[PDB]
Amino acid sequence: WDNELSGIQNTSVSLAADYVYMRLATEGFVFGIRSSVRAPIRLCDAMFLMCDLFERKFHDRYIAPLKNACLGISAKDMDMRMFFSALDSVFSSGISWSRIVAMYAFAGSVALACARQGRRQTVIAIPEWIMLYMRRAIAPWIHANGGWDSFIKFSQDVLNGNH
Ligand SMILES: [Cl-]
Ligand SMILES: [Cl-]
Ligand SMILES: [Cl-]
């Protein structure tokens, strides 16, 4: 059954795969998992560029809280439970497009840390971590706040206003 929530979920995990492998490539880890861009191109562009902007210009507001939640966990021990707990530590106070960008950016950070430790099977699972995490609260929030199209408009506004 194709319904709007399952559609949002399919888009979220396609996007998570694109973003994780793109982020890895920016540091020279070229996994070659994908044959093509999996999410819609405009959305893939939007998430990659928003994550980059947040890493460069909004790191301590959006990304540091997730990293700090994981302080003292080695890359060898990073797992989906850690990932969920860190995300919970922010989303417990609310959901926003900026916090969703932070979740994807942080998944990239975790992927990079695992790739540097050679934990290949963990890296390739991180897109599923995002998909599974979003089922309980993020996915219905996205549905109620305009779908991924609303993220595109948000991203266009933010990216057009930063230079
Ligand atoms: Cl529907
Ligand atoms: Cl790839
Ligand atoms: Cl809200």
Author numbering: 6 to 168
Sentences reproduced from the published study:
Thus, due to the functional importance of this region in C. elegans, we attempted to determine the crystal structure of both BCL-2 proteins of T. suis (designated as T. suis A and T. suis B for convenience), a representative species of clade I. We were only able to obtain crystals for T. suis A and determined its structure to high resolution (1.6 Å), revealing a classic BCL-2-fold consisting of eight α-helices. Helices α3–α4, which line the BH3 binding-groove, are essentially parallel, similar to the apo-BCL-XL structure, though closer together, particularly towards the top of the groove, resulting in a “closed” conformation, as seen in several other BCL-2 structures. The end of α3 is noticeably disordered relative to other apo-BCL-2 structures. The unstructured loop connecting α1–α2, which is significantly shorter in T. suis BCL-2 (and CED-9) compared with BCL-XL and BCL-2, was well-defined and packs primarily against α1, although with some contacts with the beginning of α6. Helix α1 is well-resolved throughout its entire length and its very N-terminal portion is in close proximity to α7, a feature not evident for other BCL-2 protein structures. Helix α8 is also extended relative to that of BCL-XL and is visible through essentially all of the juxta-transmembrane region, which is usually not seen in most BCL-2 structures. Notably, however, the short loop at the α4–α5 junction observed in the CED-9 structure was absent. As this loop is thought to be critical for CED-4 dissociation, this structure indicates that the regulation of apoptosis in T. suis is potentially distinct from C. elegans. Curiously, the loop following helix α4 in CED-9 which is required for release from CED-4 is absent from BCL-2 proteins representing clade I nematodes, as is the case in mammalian BCL-2 proteins which do not directly engage APAF-1. While this observation does not discount the possibility that BCL-2 proteins of clade I nematodes inhibit apoptosome formation in the same manner as occurs in C. elegans, it does suggest that the molecular details of the “release” mechanism are distinct from the free-living nematode.
The pro-survival BCL-2 proteins possess four BH domains (BH1–BH4) and inhibit apoptosis by binding directly to the two sub-classes of pro-apoptotic proteins, BAX/BAK/BOK and BH3-only proteins. BCL-2 proteins are defined by the presence of four regions of sequence homology, the BCL-2 homology domains (BH1–BH4). Based on the C. elegans prototype, nematode BCL-2 proteins inhibit apoptosis by sequestering the apoptosome scaffold protein, CED-4, on mitochondria. We show that the BCL-2-regulated pathway in multiple nematodes is distinct from the classically recognised pathway in C. elegans, with clear evidence for expansion of the multi-BH domain BCL-2-type proteins in some species and notable structural differences in both the BCL-2 and the APAF-1/CED-4 homologues.
